């Protein structure tokens, strides 16, 4: 069976976080619970790290622990708006393969200008809230 879980990550003062937190930002470590060998984190590059992704926020799921062996997981990321609604969701279509220190995700998860345009309601009080759902086989 599948073990489905989630993590909600709030990055405060998002508009300054490249200065205050750096080029790459790792979340706190999380898992499904206390009955779980697996430890994961999210990694964000508030500006993508090559010519092509420079206008995008990049978002990855990183396996931090040293598990039994290879882990195969599906993942879904989305952005929670001002109203508490999930938007801009994208999915791994299949299960990717993680070993300790391996990440998978989207180098171009979302355009910064989309995110920064206040009409879109994605940075209420300059807080970016990301929702990650993970599904381990």
């Amino acid at each position: 069976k599948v073990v489905k879980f989630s993590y909600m990550w709030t990055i405060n003062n998002f508009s300054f976080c490249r200065e205050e937190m750096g080029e790459v930002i790792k979340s706190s470590t999380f898992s499904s619970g206390a009955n779980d060998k697996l430890k994961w984190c999210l990694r964000v590059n508030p500006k993508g790290l090559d010519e092509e992704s420079k206008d995008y926020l990049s978002l990855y799921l990183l396996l931090v622990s040293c598990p039994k062996s290879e882990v195969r997981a599906k993942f879904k990321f989305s952005i929670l708006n001002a109203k508490g609604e999930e938007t801009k969701a994208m999915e791994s279509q299949r299960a990717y393969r993680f070993v300790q220190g391996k990440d998978w995700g989207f180098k171009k998860f979302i355009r910064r200008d989309f995110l920064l345009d206040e009409a879109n309601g994605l940075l209420p009080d300059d807080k970016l809230t990301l929702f990650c759902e993970v599904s381990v086989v």
Partner: peptide, 10 residues
Amino acid sequence: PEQDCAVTSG
């Protein structure tokens, strides 16, 4: 593209 669904590793 407002989002790009290509999955890569870091």
